Amino acid sequence: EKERVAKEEEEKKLKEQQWRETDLNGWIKDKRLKLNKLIKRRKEKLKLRDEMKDRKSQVSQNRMKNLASLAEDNDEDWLIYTDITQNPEAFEEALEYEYKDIVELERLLLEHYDWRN
Amino acid sequence: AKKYCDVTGLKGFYKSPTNNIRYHNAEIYQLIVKPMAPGVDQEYLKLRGAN
Amino acid sequence: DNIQGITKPAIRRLARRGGVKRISGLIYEETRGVLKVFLENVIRDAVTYTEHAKRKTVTAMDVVYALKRQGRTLYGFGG
Amino acid sequence: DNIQGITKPAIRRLARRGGVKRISGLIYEETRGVLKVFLENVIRDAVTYTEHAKRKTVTAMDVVYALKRQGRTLYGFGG
Amino acid sequence: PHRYKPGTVALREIRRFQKSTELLIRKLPFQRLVREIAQDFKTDLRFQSSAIGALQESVEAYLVSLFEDTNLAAIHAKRVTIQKKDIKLARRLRGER
Amino acid sequence: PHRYKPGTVALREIRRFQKSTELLIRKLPFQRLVREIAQDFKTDLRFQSSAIGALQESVEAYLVSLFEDTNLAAIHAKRVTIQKKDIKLARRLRGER
Amino acid sequence: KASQSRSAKAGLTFPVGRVHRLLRRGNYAQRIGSGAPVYLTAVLEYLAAEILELAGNAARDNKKTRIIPRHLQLAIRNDDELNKLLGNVTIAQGGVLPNIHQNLLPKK
Amino acid sequence: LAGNAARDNKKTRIIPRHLQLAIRNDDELNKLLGNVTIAQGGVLPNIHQNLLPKKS
Amino acid sequence: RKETYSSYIYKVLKQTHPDTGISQKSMSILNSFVNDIFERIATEASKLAAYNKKSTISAREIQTAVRLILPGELAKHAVSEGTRAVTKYSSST
DNA sequence: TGCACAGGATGTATATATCTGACACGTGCCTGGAGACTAGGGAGTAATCCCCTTGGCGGTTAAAACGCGGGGGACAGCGCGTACGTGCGTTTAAGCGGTGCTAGAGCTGTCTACGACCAATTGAGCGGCCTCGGCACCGGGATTCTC
DNA sequence: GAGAATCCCGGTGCCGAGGCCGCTCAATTGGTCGTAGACAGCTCTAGCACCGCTTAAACGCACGTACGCGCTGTCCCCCGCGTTTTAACCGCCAAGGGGATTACTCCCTAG
C-alpha cells in the first residue's frame, strides 16, 4: 500500500517534470495563481485571528451568543459544540501548514510591506 | 498655539482619548501610541509640560 | 443512617454536573470520606467563630467567614 | 543565544533531584517554556515595588515581598 | 420497541444537568448530617437556614471542581471509567492530603 | 568490558543528589537571563547579589515541586518516562493557568 | 455658599465621602490623603460598570429583562481577565458552563 | 526539633538542611508550613516502589 | 440602620441599560464583590505604605496597588479612568 | 378481500372576560457629609559621604556538545469476561404547610476601670573588635552491589 | 568470582562562629482623664418540634453489552561512554553612581 502510494507520488512528480519541460510558462502561471490563492487564504486567516482577539468586536459578541445558544440547548449541535472550542495552538499549526503550502507553491513557481510608504 | 504630534513632531491632527497623546496618522497610532508601555505617556507629556 | 443520609443518585447528580461519563461503585464511600474531611475543617472553624461571639447558634456570617479563611470564598451572603 | 543560558545537564540535575529514572528529550524545552513565564511573573511584581520605592536597583528585600504577596513566602534573606 | 445506545441519552442527561441550576442534595439529610457533625465540637447548637444554604453551596462547588479534576485525571490515564486512584491522584496533586 | 545497566547509575546519582542540597544552576547564565528579561520594562537596571540567589532558590524549589507532581502523574500513567502531557496535567491539577 | 458633594466634582456616581469614611475608620493608615478616595471611587466605578455591561449583555442573550445570577456567572466565567480575578470565588446559585471533552463524544 | 535533627547526624552545628529535616518530618508542622520554601535545605529522600528495580 | 450601595449601582445600570430589572440576590453578590475589591485594594495600599516607612496614603500607592492587583489592560483602563477623575476633581480653581 | 367515500369527532384560532401577580413611583427624617477655622509635624528638597557593583582583565578546568552502540519501554492490536447502564415493581420518607412554643438575638442604659498620654529615668541589646576550633578538604584503606 | 564505587579513619589551615566592652536610645514607672467593655435589663424575631397528605424519588432484582484488562510483537529512541572545546569561575583593581542621612520648611491633613 505504501509502495503503491510512493509509485503514484513518483509518477505525479514525473508528470510535473514533463509538464514543466513541455509548458513551463503555463505551469509557472498556474503555480503563481496557486501561491496567490494560498497567500489570500492565509491573509484571511490572519485577519480572522486578529479579529478574534478583540473583546469588543462583533465576532466576540457572536461567539458569546453562540456560547449562550449552546448553553440554551443532535449530531449537528454536537459538531458545533466541538468546533466552537478555542484552538490557538492549532491556529498556529494551521498557519505553519499554510506557510509551508505557500512555500511549496513558491518552489513550484520557481521550478516552472515596503518601507517607501 | 499650534498642535504637533508627540511622537514625530509633525502636524498632529488627532489625539488619543486614553492617554491624551497627539499623533499624526494611523500607523503611528497602531504601532506606537496604542501598544505603549505605562509611564512613557507622562514622559512624553513632560516635554510640553502637560503631565 | 446519617453519614449515608446522602443517597446513591446524589453522587450521580454531582457527577453529571461535572461532565463525567462512567462511574464506579467503590467511589461513593470515598466521596463520602472527602465529605467528612471537608466538613470537619469547615465547621470546626465555624464553631470557633460561633462560641467566640458568645452565641450558641450559627448565623449566616460566621460560615461565610469560615469559607473566607481557606480561600474558597462565596458571594451572595456577604451582607 | 542568551536564552540558551540554561543548560541541558542542569535540567538533568533538576530532574534527578526529583528522582526520575527516565527522562525524554522534550522535557528540557517544556521546562524552559514553563520557567520563562514563571520568573517573569515575579519580575512583574518586583520592579513595580522597586519603582514605587523611587529606587533604580533591586534587592533581596522586595523580591521576598513579591513572593510573599503571591504566596510562596521564603526564609533566609530577611523579611 | 426502540432503544438508545448506552452513552447517548447520558449525553442528554449531561446537558440537562449542565443547563439546570437547581440543587442536587435533599435539605433534611444534609441538615441532619451537619447537625450531627456539629454536635461533636459543641453541644446545644442551633442553626440558620442561610448558613445551611451557604454550606451546601460550598460543598456542591467542591465536589464539582474535584469531579472534573478526577475526570481529567481519568482521561489522562487513557480510560473512560473513573476509579478511586483517580480521586487520590487528584487530591494529592491538588495539594490537600 | 564492564557495561552498566541503564538506570542503575541514574538511581545512584539520584541518591547522591538526594543527600546533596547545593545549587544545580549556573550563576552567570541565569544572571544574563534575568537581566535580559528585566531590561524590557525600565532600562539601566542595577541588581543586588542576594536577589539573584533568592531567584535561584525560588526557581529550583518551583522546579522540584513541579517535578515531584509530574513524577506522580507519570507513575499514575503506568509509565516510567515523562511526557509533555504529564506536565500539562500537572499544571492543570495544581492550577496555575 | 452651598456646594454639592465631591462625587460630581469628580463626575462620579459612587459616594466619595463614604469611601473616605471607610478608609478613615478602617484603620489602614493613620493619615489619609485627599486624592485617595477619588481614585478608589473611580476604580470601583469602572469595575462595576464593566460587570454591569457584561451582565446586561448576558441578560439580553437569554431574552430576559432581569439579572439572574446565572447571567453574572456566565458573564464572569466566559471572559478571561474576570476569570483570573474571580477564579477562587464561587458565585451563589451560578451553575457550571457547558463543556464536553472531544474524546468523550461519539466520534465513530 | 532542630537540635534533635542536629544530634542524629553527628553535627553540633545547625544547618538549614537540618532545619528542613526538622520541619518536614512532623506532619502538623509540615502543613503549618506547606506554603513555605526554605533556603539551602533540600528535599527528603523518597524513592518510589515502581521505580525501584529488580525483585526481592 | 444598614448600609448598601444599591442606588448608585442601580443608576450605573440605568445609564447603559434602561429597560433591565434586578434580582435582590444580584445586589447581594455585587455588593459583596465591590466590598471585596475595596478590601483587597485598601489593604494592599496599606501594606505598601507600611513598606515604604510612610504614614500617609495618597493616590500613588493605590495606583501601584491597582497595577499590582488588576490584569494589565484592566489596570491601564482603571488608571486611565482614575487619572482623568482625579485631574477633573483637582481642577477646583 | 381490499379500497374509496362520507359522516362524525375533535382540534384550534383568536379575541374576549375576569382576574390576580409581582413590579415601579410619591412622601417623611435624621444623621452624616460638607463648609469653616486652628495646629503641627510629615513629606520634600538637597547635599554629602561612602560602598558596592558593574566592566575588565586572564588562566584553567570542570563540564557541555557531539557522535556512537545497544536494550528495555512505549506503541497498537486482539481476545475474555464483567460491571455499569437500563428497566419495572415496590416502597418511603422528602416536601409543604400548618401550628404551637419559647430560647435567644438584639437594642438601651449606666457605670468605672482599663488604657492612651505625658514626663522623667536607667539599662541592655546592638556593634566594633578580638580570638580560636568544627567542619570542609585531601589522602588512603575497608566494603558493598553489580556484572 | 572481579570492579567501580562507595563508606570510613586520620592530618590541615581557616575563616567564620563565640565573648566583651561602650554606650545610646528604648523599655520602665508614675499620674490623669475620658471614654469603651461589661453587666443588667428589656422587647419580639425566629429557631425547634410534630402531624399529616402527596408522591416523586429511591432501593432491588434482572440482564446485556461495550470497556477494563491481560498478553504480545515491535521499532526506536533514550542511556552509558569516549572526545573536543567552550564558556564558567576565581583573584583582583579601579570608578563612580546610587543609597543613607542629615536639616530646615511649609502645607495640609487631624480635630
Residue numbers in the entry:
A (entry chain R): 434 to 506, 532 to 570, 584 to 588
B (entry chain S): 112 to 162
C (entry chain B), D (entry chain F): 25 to 103
E (entry chain A), F (entry chain E): 38 to 134
G (entry chain G): 13 to 120
H (entry chain C): 66 to 121
I (entry chain H): 36 to 128
The authors write:
However, amongst these remodelers, the INO80 chromatin remodeler appears largely sufficient to generate the well positioned +1 and −1 nucleosomes. S.c INO80 is a multi-subunit complex consisting of 15 subunits that are divided into three different modules. The catalytic module with the Ino80 (ATPase) RecA lobes and insert, Arp5, Ies6, Ies2, Rvb1 and Rvb2, constitutes the core unit of INO80 (C-module).
We found that the remodeling rates of nucleosomes containing all S.c histones were within 2-fold of remodeling rates containing S.c H2A, H2B, H3 and X.l H4. Shortening the flanking DNA from 80 to 40 bp for S.c nucleosomes reduced the remodeling rate of INO80 by ~100-fold. In comparison, for the INO80: S.c 0/80 (ADP/BeFx) and INO80: X.l 0/80 (ADP/BeFx) datasets, a much smaller proportion of particles fell in classes 1a and 1b. It is further informative that, for the INO80: S.c 0/40 (ADP/BeFx) and INO80: X.l 0/40 (ADP/BeFx) complexes, only a small proportion of particles have either clear or partial density for the Arp8 module on the flanking DNA. Our structures with 0/40 nucleosomes suggest that the Arp8 module sequesters the HSA away from flanking DNA thereby inhibiting its ability to bind flanking DNA.
